[PDB]
Amino acid sequence: AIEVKLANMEAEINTLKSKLELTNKLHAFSMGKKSGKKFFVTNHERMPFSKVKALCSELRGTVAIPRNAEENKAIQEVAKTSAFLGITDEVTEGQFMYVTGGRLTYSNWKKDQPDDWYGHGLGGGEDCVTIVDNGLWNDISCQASHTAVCEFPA
Amino acid sequence: AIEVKLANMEAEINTLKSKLELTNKLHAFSMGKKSGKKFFVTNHERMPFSKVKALCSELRGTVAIPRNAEENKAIQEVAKTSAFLGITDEVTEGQFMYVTGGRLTYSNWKKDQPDDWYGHGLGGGEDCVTIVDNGLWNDISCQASHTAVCEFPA
Amino acid sequence: AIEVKLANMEAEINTLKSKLELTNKLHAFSMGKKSGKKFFVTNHERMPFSKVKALCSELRGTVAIPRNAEENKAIQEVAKTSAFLGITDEVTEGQFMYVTGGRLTYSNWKKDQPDDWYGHGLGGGEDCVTIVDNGLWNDISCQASHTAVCEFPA
Ligand SMILES: CC(=O)N[C@@H]1[C@@H](O)[C@@H](O)[C@@H](CO)O[C@H]1O
Ligand SMILES: CC(=O)N[C@@H]1[C@@H](O)[C@@H](O)[C@@H](CO)O[C@H]1O
Ligand SMILES: CC(=O)N[C@@H]1[C@@H](O)[C@@H](O)[C@@H](CO)O[C@H]1O
Ligand SMILES: [Ca+2]
Ligand SMILES: [Ca+2]
Ligand SMILES: [Ca+2]
Ligand SMILES: [Ca+2]
Ligand SMILES: [Ca+2]
Ligand SMILES: [Ca+2]
Ligand SMILES: [Ca+2]
Ligand SMILES: [Ca+2]
Ligand SMILES: [Ca+2]
Ligand SMILES: [Cl-]
Ligand SMILES: [Cl-]
């Protein structure tokens, strides 16, 4: 009976959907995702901010955004090098916004940062933000190439 | 049409099964799984034994258990810090057993361990086991938080 | 009812295909795949050449093959020790060919190599090639055990 075959096939599909969910949980776990916390991951490739945005979007994620000390340390450890954060004041100078919307709240600026430097020689000031090796932040040219770190929901 | 469509769906489902199996194989390989050998994975999160057990269970794995010096070495390599092992004397004080059942066939106890110590203030003695930095074992409170290391079959 | 169910099943299968593709993209990213570049992966296990071939084949990949300095560097960094490349002169002594077919177009041989040395006592000369610690190449016995590094398309 076609109905029986259809029913058995629906069961197979459900089994596969659960298997894939497990595959995703195992991968996240293997990559360091902590229980109930956002998942941060990188391919260790350095690229301009525009590229990071496109890459994370393709993966259905967003550019890493630290919203507290814990998340900051987590991203720092993942990146292990200067990486772009999803924060920018491209629109209005001095008004840093999350790529996901909203004005900047938590921050971990290095002393004297942000300074919107123009002397880097790339044109424009510094409208992007990078978390440096020590975990502190520094505004940088969005044209510069820093590590791509994407984040996925908790 | 209906029957031809249903027949294609079977092929679609079968093909997806094979692709997901291949995905799992590649993932195990990327996580360092050696041919015909079980493998260990961690997200580097520290939590109480009960949480590790539930977490590994959810991944269809088990809390890491060393059956020989090689596996013990592999687990410490994966963990990097003190991690719980799937061995406890919760059923009968003094008699350590595998969470998977049965008595120990291999041990690597640290000198003067196990000691079922109470001075840790967590209440009760020590019924769980952790592999320490240098591969040796120590019994610790199951309430204590140590690294979660899951094991997957060979 | 039957046709609506078949239509939903087609939709379920397509969503599953879509999610698996996303899972594969995320996995490659997490394993260091650089944008538009072929990627190399290893489980850090050492084995004879025939085993590496069988293994990478099972993963629907191929034994790593550098076609230029950049790829050679990438493989070197992934393996971090001597590893077999998909290059051999088994078909015609002295003529190194890619396992994927065709004569070498890029080479990075160490000084005095290849030498089809017999002194290893394994039998036969040296018909396989490994990339050594510094990125240079040496022909070695296909029967020797070196790191398995698989390659997947860009
Ligand atoms: C990597 C880094 O910190 N770069 C900063 C640059 O952004 C700008 O602030 C400049 C001002 O002199 O100082 C540099 O140290
Ligand atoms: C982490 C560790 O080793 N803890 C042990 C504890 O389990 C208990 O054995 C105590 C006895 O005095 O000694 C401690 O060093
Ligand atoms: C691992 C390695 O480099 N082996 C080489 C071997 O292939 C052969 O060339 C021999 C010549 O005497 O030298 C060895 O060092
Ligand atoms: Ca500006
Ligand atoms: Ca600015
Ligand atoms: Ca700055
Ligand atoms: Ca089709
Ligand atoms: Ca005890
Ligand atoms: Ca103890
Ligand atoms: Ca549904
Ligand atoms: Ca030869
Ligand atoms: Ca040689
Ligand atoms: Cl206990
Ligand atoms: Cl040979």
Side-chain angles (χ1 to χ4, degrees):
Chain A
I2 305 177
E3 291 93 346
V4 161
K5 192 178 303 178
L6 200 58
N8 295 155
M9 285 176 49
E10 285 177 336
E12 283 262 78
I13 294 169
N14 290 326
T15 295
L16 284 176
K17 298 254 186 174
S18 304
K19 193 159 183 290
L20 181 57
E21 160 74 10
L22 183 64
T23 294
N24 290 155
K25 284 197 295 284
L26 182 52
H27 173 260
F29 177 77
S30 74
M31 292 307 294
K33 189 193 190 298
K34 308 293 184 296
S35 302
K37 308 295 194 185
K38 296 187 301 190
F39 176 42
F40 300 106
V41 53
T42 178
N43 64 341
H44 299 285
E45 191 187 340
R46 298 176 70 76
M47 61 191 80
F49 187 68
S50 295
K51 297 286 207 65
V52 179
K53 280 187 296 181
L55 192 45
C56 294
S57 281
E58 184 187 299
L59 301 172
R60 309 304 172 238
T62 59
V63 188
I65 293 174
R67 295 177 194 274
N68 62 55
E70 289 63 51
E71 294 185 2
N72 202 79
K73 186 173 62 65
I75 298 177
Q76 173 194 2
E77 290 175 1
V78 166
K80 296 177 295 181
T81 181
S82 57
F84 277 114
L85 296 175
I87 305 168
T88 192
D89 69 324
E90 285 169 318
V91 181
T92 311
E93 184 56 42
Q95 188 181 162
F96 285 92
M97 306 290 281
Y98 295 122
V99 296
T100 36
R103 288 168 174 67
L104 177 67
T105 54
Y106 164 86
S107 66
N108 198 41
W109 297 114
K110 282 189 76 304
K111 51 180 162 297
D112 298 292
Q113 299 304 337
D115 68 347
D116 196 38
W117 194 39
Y118 272 75
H120 44 71
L122 290 170
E126 293 184 325
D127 296 334
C128 278
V129 189
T130 58
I131 182 176
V132 289
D133 295 67
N134 59 2
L136 294 176
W137 298 7
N138 169 60
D139 60 332
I140 202 67
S141 174
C142 294
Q143 298 178 57
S145 295
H146 293 270
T147 302
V149 179
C150 305
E151 81 170 51
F152 301 83
Chain B
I2 297 314
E3 292 150 88
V4 172
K5 274 179 175 288
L6 197 59
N8 177 54
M9 301 279 237
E10 302 181 78
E12 294 288 355
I13 290 168
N14 286 334
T15 294
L16 282 176
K17 283 191 173 184
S18 302
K19 290 188 182 188
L20 176 55
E21 287 180 75
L22 176 59
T23 289
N24 283 158
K25 284 185 181 178
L26 176 58
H27 186 240
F29 177 81
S30 65
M31 283 333 282
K33 186 196 187 300
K34 305 301 186 299
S35 298
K37 292 202 181 301
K38 62 179 62 81
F39 71 111
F40 312 99
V41 194
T42 183
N43 60 341
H44 290 105
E45 185 182 355
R46 303 181 71 83
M47 61 191 69
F49 188 64
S50 54
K51 308 307 291 291
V52 178
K53 278 199 301 183
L55 178 50
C56 296
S57 181
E58 189 187 334
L59 301 177
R60 293 309 182 291
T62 53
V63 182
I65 295 172
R67 306 285 179 164
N68 57 55
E70 172 206 20
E71 301 183 351
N72 194 82
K73 188 65 183 178
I75 298 170
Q76 65 159 131
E77 289 302 290
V78 173
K80 301 303 185 196
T81 182
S82 59
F84 280 118
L85 300 184
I87 300 162
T88 76
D89 68 331
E90 290 195 290
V91 174
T92 312
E93 182 50 41
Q95 174 174 279
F96 285 85
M97 307 284 275
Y98 294 118
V99 297
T100 54
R103 284 99 110 196
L104 294 185
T105 59
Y106 165 79
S107 61
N108 195 22
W109 293 112
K110 179 181 174 303
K111 178 190 187 292
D112 300 314
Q113 300 302 337
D115 65 354
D116 195 53
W117 189 59
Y118 192 109
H120 55 71
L122 291 166
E126 296 178 322
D127 287 2
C128 280
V129 178
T130 54
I131 181 175
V132 301
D133 315 336
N134 69 4
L136 294 174
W137 301 3
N138 169 48
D139 60 336
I140 204 75
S141 174
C142 294
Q143 298 177 55
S145 290
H146 290 270
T147 310
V149 182
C150 303
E151 169 190 315
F152 298 91
Chain C
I2 197 163
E3 294 152 283
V4 161
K5 286 189 175 60
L6 276 168
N8 176 66
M9 182 175 288
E10 265 160 38
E12 291 283 358
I13 290 171
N14 288 335
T15 56
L16 199 47
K17 283 182 173 180
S18 192
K19 288 193 59 189
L20 180 55
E21 163 73 5
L22 189 65
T23 293
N24 287 160
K25 279 196 178 178
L26 176 56
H27 173 260
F29 177 78
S30 80
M31 288 317 141
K33 186 188 192 295
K34 302 303 182 300
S35 307
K37 303 297 181 183
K38 49 186 67 161
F39 87 113
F40 313 92
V41 191
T42 186
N43 63 343
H44 299 298
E45 189 185 352
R46 294 171 78 80
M47 63 195 67
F49 186 67
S50 51
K51 298 280 198 61
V52 181
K53 287 220 296 293
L55 189 167
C56 296
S57 183
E58 181 158 55
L59 298 180
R60 284 187 188 152
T62 54
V63 186
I65 295 177
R67 310 285 177 148
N68 58 46
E70 176 198 6
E71 290 174 14
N72 197 80
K73 181 56 179 172
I75 296 165
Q76 165 184 200
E77 295 191 74
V78 162
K80 290 182 283 68
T81 190
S82 58
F84 279 118
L85 301 180
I87 301 166
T88 73
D89 70 323
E90 299 173 306
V91 180
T92 308
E93 179 57 36
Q95 315 302 316
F96 284 88
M97 312 284 271
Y98 299 116
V99 296
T100 35
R103 45 192 296 229
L104 293 188
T105 53
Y106 165 80
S107 69
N108 199 35
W109 301 108
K110 197 178 181 181
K111 179 171 171 287
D112 308 303
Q113 301 304 338
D115 64 351
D116 191 54
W117 184 60
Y118 280 69
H120 49 77
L122 295 177
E126 296 181 318
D127 288 357
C128 278
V129 185
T130 56
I131 177 169
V132 298
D133 292 32
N134 59 12
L136 301 173
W137 305 358
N138 174 43
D139 59 336
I140 197 78
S141 171
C142 291
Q143 290 79 321
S145 295
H146 291 281
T147 307
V149 176
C150 304
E151 172 191 322
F152 303 91

